[PDB]
Design a binder for this molecule. Structure first.
Ligand code: HEC
Ligand code: HEC
Ligand code: HEM
Ligand code: HEM
Ligand code: HEM
Ligand code: HEM
Ligand SMILES: C/C=C(C)/C=C/C=C/[C@H](OC)[C@@H](C)[C@@H](OC)[C@@H](C)CCc1oc2c(O)c(OC)cc(OC)c2c(=O)c1C
Ligand code: FES
Ligand code: FES
Lengths: 183, 248, 431, 431, 248, 183
């Protein structure tokens, strides 16, 4: 009734809440422990990188890309209709709400010029996270991730393949002409 | 004057952990490492709790590291460890010493009638610092180095003041560590009289936190296992009272 | 029902006392015997060979753990030390690495024996479904195995296959850093992947308990697809023989042959199946030029990359959801679900012909699926150009339709053949 | 013969179809039910608590493996990182460490409940013997677990306990470097001891299968020591109740109490049992001043160091073999064999009284062996001075004689007490 | 031209491993490491097989090591690895490269029609050394550094002699590694004409041994699994012939 | 067919020899792998060790002992009846067949003098292999292993406890007065 059937189902509630919030800390351990919980900015001495190549760099586990965009790769990156992009967001943290124009895939050099010459995105492809072959490879004078065949232009925007977004531009910022702070 | 954590539901003293932090940095860090303590934890809850950007500035001042990738130096970051001070003249890494030391012998040497009290560890630290003495029994111009400590059981005893029979016929024994607190050696912020006892009361509680930094968490955890398994127990008793009474 | 055979009467005095306290004498007698149908061909060996290959894996699996060190800085070197310095340690590593191919080669022959002869269909549905979760575990296990020596194949597949769970919308990013132990594929990942590659093959051995349990309980199947006379006891005797010493010995023989094969492969071409960039110590900055998944994941590999966002059915679904099932997550769902429609196989055969060689319409779609499979594994090696993007799209779709259209058709749209009524009758038909 | 209960008739349509393919419904029904004697007191809870503690160990055991790195340079630091940085990783470490005490505290109460009430003695011999190898395994397992965080207690116990096998003459030095992986206790030892501290608790779960199997087959024992009316079916109903929901719930309750206990121990004194020199990173040059074995190994510790070569019986045997069973090897044989005469317990009770509180002569030697045990664990903490060398020699010899002299005597030299004939009758002597 | 191991039951050439060993020490060791090869293995069975006390003397000459305990240098021992030559201008650690390189199709990325033959690796090495060329079609200056190699698929190409479309109009690609064998660069012991081909044939078989040093063992192992599982098989066939013939 | 009789039992011989010499390499792996397969001599610069103490030193896994024997410890080690020893072998490799006299527990200095002043044994106690507390501890003005309580004199010979032999003297040898070669 409830004198010989209420304090039966009540106990198996406590025999579920106790063996529940004991089975949650078994899950939580597998999250990021404090040895990797945070990791803040780094400084990159560009200063002596040559022109028209990329410099790959590890930060927070996975690579960052810095290509100093040569002449072909700014013409053919500006020659790109905004409406002929999948992801039409800038993928930029510096310029948050912006759209994926070739002027939104860029860093200013002294702290204000901005010429199309600084391309800094990070080496995680948006499909399943591999790295793209650089120096004009594949089919859009850009970047070919050979993992499941995504293709990128010369602003890291997405063209062919399964990768649903462009390459993210991080929170990059200059300090002087020798140096870039990733933060 | 009896520690703050210790008891049945006491916590770390917010004040005293900070107070005792400064004593490590100024006095003990030249001869002792914390190679199992990540520096970032100063700013953590349930500890001394500092400013994060202070912690960064503090960490900058600790010495360089042959960093594992570049293979070359840099100013130390807050993600990194305190340095391994174990070279020469250097003592043990006290990285987790305040649970590595428990010179507690009895009752009937098995761990028995410690029934109002505890296990012993932070209080061996307190006694190690205070107990630096004049060499009592015999011995002339020191042992050069090896300073007499009245608590340190396990080190040098000369056989001139060991025995003819066998054992040491003295209590403590001779360390290797200079009497590290000549009194008022640093200056406090929350008033607090900087005595040799008050500095050694204080740096004890800090080095406990470099052993159980998650301590005030287990005190919190305990109360909740007490409710949960308590009234699962109480509820399981009621389910045997009014279920077995058919056959009782 | 239960095929009736003469069970265990504890006869001698030994066994009379044993049986009062632990009846293991009889449990092994009543399972080593068992009225097992007498017409069974060599496509039925591939379950002993599987079970053997699980013991072999389990066994070499532990030797390796006495030597391999699961931490990034030590990991590839430890494995490498196993090759050089551990006595016989190269023949352990090669045997446990090539083992997983054998383990997987034969699980396929196991599955296509079962697909022909109605071995998914009643009474056999629980035998089938339990094999699914064994399958699932076997793949996820051989995944985590590959991550361990932290070579480039190891590393990037870990970045890929954990990223697969990121494809899940909303909750999916969280599931990522949960399996990852954070931001990237660092060490916390390799420490947790040592753990679970050890635990899971024991769960797998407990599920072959419940698989051996099931196929005993249904009664063992035979290639006429007819059941094994559970009416009298002496007509069962004309239908069946005991496992031991007839079907034990057959399963031993083919195993000694399968092993005669397998030993030559380790001894004279042990890195054929292995993709040599795993001997390239893992670089978190360069994904290799020729990153191929290991062979036994290749046909499902291809299902994932059939469906780019040019494939109209994707565009449609990205269209109808208006943003969510893009060709990332679509291809995930595609591949995961390419398996789910193979789980679904007893519910979607509608025909009450059990078997195979008395079903000539089904018989030719099937050898199209065998083909389909081999072509699907093949086209995984091929790039995403024309014609390969089409070829893959054909293979993927044939597959996906065989379980969905062709199977719950063919019941309606086909009549049988000369099907026998006795297991003996087929067996007597030659002489 | 076996207690007649109403078994499983697959009643509703669900279960009728399930049972044609996998009868698990009924196997769980016919084991969660079971005519379990109704007079069972709280000394019978300690087998559920044991089984729980094994699940608890197995579970927290793997968590820890996702984090702990088994190699000498990383090992103590990884464990140390688990305390600090793994979310809730201190409460895992403390719970898996203190677990092994609980796992061992209660296996002792389990063993002395069994020692009183004739639970070794027929029909119950195989129930007993399987518990022996579960014991051996649990000890060796908890050994290898303690080696892992490479502290000084870890290190030296591995130098000691491997060295125990070196005490074997002739072949014994080889068996040493075999477990060692060479000359000393270096790293090859800690890599192999990671492996087998993972494997062995699975073998242990597979033997609690054959333990639960056995005590069902004998029928569950009761404190009258009389068997449970296997003649009619309705007199068994007066004798027994079903496990579920009477004896499931009792074993739940006491567990929730045992766990209420165990959680307060982890939360407020978690290094009490742990001997603090394990937080002293392992030095291969200094064996510590106060090297005590872990508490649950202490009374057998003492049996090894009772027998120095002053102990006359040693001198005798070193005498008689003329060199071979010196007090090294003798004390090994003494300690290993101190266990072997507890395995031997059903053959050396001669009395055909099964139980206990109807046996008043036996009942007081027993509380001497409880005391003996407590004194033996105690005197392991004590040095080898007078009186302690004598005390330990008294304890060790009492022990060794209880199973050898006192037990196959007392059959002859003692008559019973008022023993009942019904399980109900004792139970009603209360109603 | 055609190696000694390769085949169905061939072994390592005793002579050629020794011949090729010297080429690593004199030419390649300045720019390449073997950090996964313990030096003591030169004297091992089934390899080049040297004198143990020579091996010691040889090992002395390889450079120092910040030894892990003392924290300071010494002359390298024979228990130790070859050094990690990976600094600057340095190439890949070839420590286990001759199974890390297999630039081979099928048509499949993972492999097909290799049925009289093998897997490919020691023969990429041979072709890497021989194929240092003049620059085909155009690319008529170098690239400063980056030397044209006709075999090295995976590197730099001046797009001038890549394409207007996609790939390379000129055969291999541009390395980063100087043409390392200007002919007769060292002197042999068992006669043997020290050609650029004969030095590159020879150092190939040695670097295979730094990948499979236990190789002549698996050849030995193979023969015994062939007997054992062979006449367990043959014996199990006879146990089905004359046991099933009651029902056959 | 005709070759048939014991063929049943013949096959189960091959089904035992094959699954025997397959279960042997499962054993052999656990032996010493080649990373520890050998170990060779070291040099110890005594020179600046002070008098009447011990210097402990790691060689081949486990510690070696060097005590420079002070006056008490050569009187009271020579004052020892040979037949009042358990192990009455020298435990020396240098002096193999010798018996455990205080002149057989020693080494040269000026490659030939031998005064009772050089005590070099190794820190593996003979019971179960722990280390002995030094500087006159326990009860024989010597060495107390606190593992199962063995007692040693001042020549490492065995007195009380369970340890059946004396501490072994290795293959020690001098080179000049500053240095000892353990080989
Ligand atoms: C260098 C001049 C030191 C100063 C400053 C501090 N310590 Fe130290 N300590 C030093 C040495 C060389 C040793 C060796 C061990 C011995 O034989 O005495 C020590 C020892 C300790 C110990 C315990 C070691 C043991 O064996 O129990 C402790 C707990 C300790 N030291 C603590 C400590 C504290 C709290 C200090 C700051 C006030 C401090 N030490 C300073 C060298 C030096
Ligand atoms: C310094 C002048 C070197 C000499 C001497 C040798 N190698 Fe080398 N090598 C060097 C560099 C900087 C590289 C970089 C990779 C590239 O972009 O070319 C290499 C490369 C190799 C490789 C393969 C690398 C790859 O990407 O496939 C191999 C197999 C190789 N080198 C072999 C090799 C041999 C056999 C040598 C002795 C005759 C030798 N190298 C000398 C630098 C230098
Ligand atoms: C990988 C571990 C496996 C082991 C160890 C194993 C073992 C066995 C054995 C001994 C049999 C009996 C006959 C035979 O050998 O053909 C069998 C049959 C069968 N298995 Fe498996 N098998 C495994 C995998 C699978 C998988 C992965 C599936 C499903 C996708 C599956 C489904 C079946 C079915 C349906 C049968 C036939 C039932 C019958 O003949 O009554 N099995 N297996
Ligand atoms: C279902 C059973 C198993 C499967 C399918 C399997 C699969 C694999 C695979 C594919 C690898 C990679 C081999 C390589 O690339 O070198 C591997 C490695 C490894 N596995 Fe297993 N394995 C199984 C059982 C086990 C078990 C039970 C253990 C538990 C100890 C284990 C421990 C290891 C270790 C230590 C390695 C590293 C050795 C190496 O990489 O060569 N394996 N496994
Ligand atoms: C450590 C794992 C063990 C588990 C998980 C376990 C579990 C159980 C359970 C559930 C029972 C039934 C009644 C009870 O709880 O008292 C039982 C009884 C028993 N156990 Fe164990 N037990 C273990 C250890 C042992 C050991 C170590 C021994 C022998 C030295 C042993 C010998 C027995 C005997 C003789 C009985 C009584 C049989 C009966 O009541 O018919 N058990 N155990
Ligand atoms: C019969 C079950 C078990 C027993 C008696 C047992 C016992 C122990 C003990 C006493 C320790 C030392 C704890 C310490 O000093 O910190 C330990 C450590 C450890 N055990 Fe177990 N354990 C069991 C189950 C398992 C299993 C199944 C695993 C398999 C993954 C495992 C993995 C570990 C690990 C990684 C450690 C090191 C963590 C640490 O030392 O704190 N345990 N075990
Ligand atoms: C933490 C991890 C856990 C809990 C396990 C997760 C398991 C997921 C699945 O297990 C059932 C998974 C193994 C299974 O998916 C159905 C496989 C067939 C995955 C197929 C697979 O393989 C690849 C591979 O091998 C690579 O190597 C060089 C590289 C790869 O990229 C290029 C892939 C890849 O793109 C895919 C889809
Ligand atoms: S993951 Fe970038 S291509 Fe599939
Ligand atoms: S080990 Fe030396 S006394 Fe037991």
């Amino acid at each position: 009734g409830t004198r010989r059937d209420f304090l039966y189902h009540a106990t198996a509630a406590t025999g579920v809440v106790v063996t529940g919030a004991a089975v949650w800390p078994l899950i939580n351990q597998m999250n990021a422990s404090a040895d990797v919980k945070a990791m803040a900015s780094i400084f990159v001495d560009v200063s002596a990188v040559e022109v028209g190549t990329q410099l790959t760099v590890k930060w927070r586990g996975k690579p960052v890309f810095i290509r100093r965009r040569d002449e072909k790769d700014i013409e053919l990156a500006r020659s790109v209709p905004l409406g002929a992009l999948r992801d039409t967001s800038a993928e930029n943290a510096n310029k948050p709400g912006a759209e994926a124009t070739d002027e939104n895939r860029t860093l200013p050099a002294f702290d204000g010029t901005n010429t199309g010459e600084w391309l800094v995105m990070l080496g995680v492809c948006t499909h399943l996270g591999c790295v793209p072959m650089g120096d004009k490879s594949g089919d859009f004078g850009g970047w070919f991730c050979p993992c499941h065949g995504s293709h990128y232009d010369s602003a890291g925007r997405i063209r062919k393949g399964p990768a649903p977004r462009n390459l993210d531009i991080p929170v990059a910022a200059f300090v002087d002409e020798t140096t870039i702070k990733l933060g | 004057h009896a520690f703050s954590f210790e008891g049945i539901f006491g916590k770390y003293d917010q004040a005293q952990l900070r107070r005792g932090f400064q004593v490590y940095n100024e006095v003990c860090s030249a001869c002792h490492g914390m190679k199992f303590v990540p520096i970032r934890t100063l700013a953590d809850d349930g500890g001394p709790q500092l400013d994060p950007t202070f912690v960064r500035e503090y960490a900058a001042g600790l010495d360089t590291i042959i960093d594992k990738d570049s293979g070359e130096e840099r100013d130390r970051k807050e993600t990194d460890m305190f340095p391994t001070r174990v070279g020469d003249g250097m003592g043990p890494d006290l990285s987790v010493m305040a649970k590595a030391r428990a010179g507690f012998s009895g009752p009937a040497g098995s761990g028995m009638n410690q029934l109002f009290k505890g296990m012993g560890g932070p209080e061996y630290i307190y006694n190690y610092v205070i107990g630096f003495e004049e060499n009592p029994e015999c011995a002339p111009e020191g042992i050069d180095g090896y300073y007499y400590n009245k608590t340190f059981q396990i080190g040098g005893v000369p056989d001139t003041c060991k025995d003819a029979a066998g054992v040491k016929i003295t209590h403590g024994s001779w360390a290797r560590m200079p009497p590290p607190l000549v009194d008022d050696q640093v200056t406090y912020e929350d008033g607090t009289p900087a005595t040799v006892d008050q500095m050694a009361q204080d740096v004890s509680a800090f080095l406990m936190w470099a052993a159980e930094p998650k301590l005030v968490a287990r005190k919190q955890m305990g109360l909740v296992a007490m409710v949960m398994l308590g009234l699962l127990s109480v509820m399981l008793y009621l389910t045997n009272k009014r279920l077995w009474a058919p056959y009782k | 029902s239960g095929i009736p055979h003469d069970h265990y009467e504890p006869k001698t005095g030994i066994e009379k006392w044993l049986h009062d306290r632990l009846p293991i004498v009889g449990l092994v007698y009543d399972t080593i015997m068992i009225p097992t149908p007498k017409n069974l061909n060599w496509w039925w060996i591939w379950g002993i060979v599987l079970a053997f290959t699980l013991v072999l894996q389990i066994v070499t699996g532990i030797v390796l753990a006495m030597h391999y060190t699961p931490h990034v800085d030590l990991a590839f070197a430890s494995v490498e030390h196993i090759m050089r310095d551990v006595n016989g340690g190269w023949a352990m590593r090669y045997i446990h690495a090539n083992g997983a191919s054998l383990f997987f080669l034969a699980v396929y022959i196991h599955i296509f024996r079962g697909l022909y002869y109605g071995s998914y269909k009643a009474p056999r549905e629980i035998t089938w479904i339990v094999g699914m979760v064994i399958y699932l575990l076997m793949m996820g296990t051989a995944f985590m195995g590959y991550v361990l020596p932290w070579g480039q194949m190891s590393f990037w597949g870990a970045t890929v296959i954990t990223g697969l769970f990121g494809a899940i919308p909303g909750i999916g990013p969280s599931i990522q850093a949960w399996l990852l132990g954070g931001p990237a594929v660092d060490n916390a990942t390799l420490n947790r992947f040592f753990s679970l590659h050890y635990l899971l093959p024991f769960v797998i051995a407990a599920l072959v308990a419940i698989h051996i349990w099931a196929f005993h309980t249904t009664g063992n199947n035979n290639p006429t697809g007819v059941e094994v006379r559970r009416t009298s006891k002496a007509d069962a005797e004309k239908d069946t023989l005991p496992f031991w010493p007839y079907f034990v010995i057959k399963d031993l023989f083919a195993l000694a042959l399968v092993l005669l094969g397998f030993f030559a492969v380790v001894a004279y071409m042990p890195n054929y199946l292995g993709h040599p960039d795993n001997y390239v110590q893992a670089n978190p900055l360069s994904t290799p030029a020729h990153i191929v998944p290991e062979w036994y994941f290749l046909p499902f590999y291809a299902i994932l990359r059939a469906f780019a966002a040019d494939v109209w059915v994707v565009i449609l679904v990205d269209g109808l959801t208006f943003g969510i099932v893009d060709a990332k997550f679509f291809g995930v769902i595609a591949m995961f679900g390419a398996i789910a429609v193979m789980a679904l196989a007893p519910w979607l055969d509608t025909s009450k012909v059990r078997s195979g060689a008395y079903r000539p319409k089904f018989r030719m779609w099937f050898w199209f699926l065998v083909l389909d499979f081999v072509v699907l594994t093949w086209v995984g090696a091929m790039p995403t150009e024309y014609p390969y993007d089409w070829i893959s799209l054909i293979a993927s779709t044939y597959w996906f339709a065989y379980f969905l259209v062709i199977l719950p058709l063919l019941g309606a749209t086909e009549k049988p053949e000369p099907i026998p009524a006795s297991i003996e009758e087929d067996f007597n038909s030659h002489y």
